[PDB]
Design a protein around this nucleic acid. Sequence first.
RNA 1: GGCACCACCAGGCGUGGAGCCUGCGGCUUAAUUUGACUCAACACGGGGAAACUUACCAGGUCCAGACAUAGCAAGGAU
Length: 118
Amino acid sequence: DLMTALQLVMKKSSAHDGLVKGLREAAKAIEKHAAQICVLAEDCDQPDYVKLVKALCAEHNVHLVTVPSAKTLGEWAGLCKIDSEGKARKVVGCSCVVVKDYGEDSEGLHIVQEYVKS
RNA sequence: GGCACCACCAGGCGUGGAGCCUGCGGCUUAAUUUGACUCAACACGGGGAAACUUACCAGGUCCAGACAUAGCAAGGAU
Ligand SMILES: [K+]
Ligand SMILES: [K+]
Ligand SMILES: [Mg+2]
Ligand SMILES: [Mg+2]
Ligand SMILES: [Mg+2]
Ligand SMILES: [Mg+2]
C-alpha cells in the first residue's frame, strides 16, 4: 500500500509524461527547479554516482526514495517494451527517475507523498 | 476503269545557289543525355536548356530505407 506499491503513481506519471530518467538528465531536472521525487537504485557500483546525486538533491529540496534492483527501476520507468502479458521485457537498467511535473492522477501519490513527508 | 494541286496540266509563289537562325547526321568531347529516320524523323517530343529543367559529365551532401525481427542502450541508442 506504500513504497513498492507506489510504482503505480509513476506509471501514471510516465503515461502523462514527466519521468526525466538518467543522471545526465536527472541533474538538469533538478537545477531546473522542476524535480519532485528522485527514486534511486543502490545496485549502482560507482560510489561517486550516489554521492553526487545525493549532493544535488541536498542542494535543492525535493525528495529521495531508495529502491533496490535497478532492473526493476528500469521496469517501472518504462525502460522496456511491454511485450506480452508475461512481459518478457529486455529491460534497461535505470538509476535515477526524476518525476519532474509528476503524474497528476494523484491517488497513491498522496500516500507516497506522506512517505515523502517522512 | 476511276479519283486526287499532299498528282499532273495552265500558271503564281517558292525551295534547292548566298549570309544567318534553327533541327538532324557526322566529327570532337569529361559529357557534348536522349527518343524519332520515305510519305508517316529532321523550328518534332509543344524540346526558344545561363541556374532549375537535365535524363549527360566532375565532384560534394542527404535519407525522404515504412514496417517486422534480433541486438546496442537513461552508467545513454542516438
Ligand atoms: K532559292
Ligand atoms: K517538324
Ligand atoms: Mg506545274
Ligand atoms: Mg540556301
Ligand atoms: Mg543544366
Ligand atoms: Mg545541376
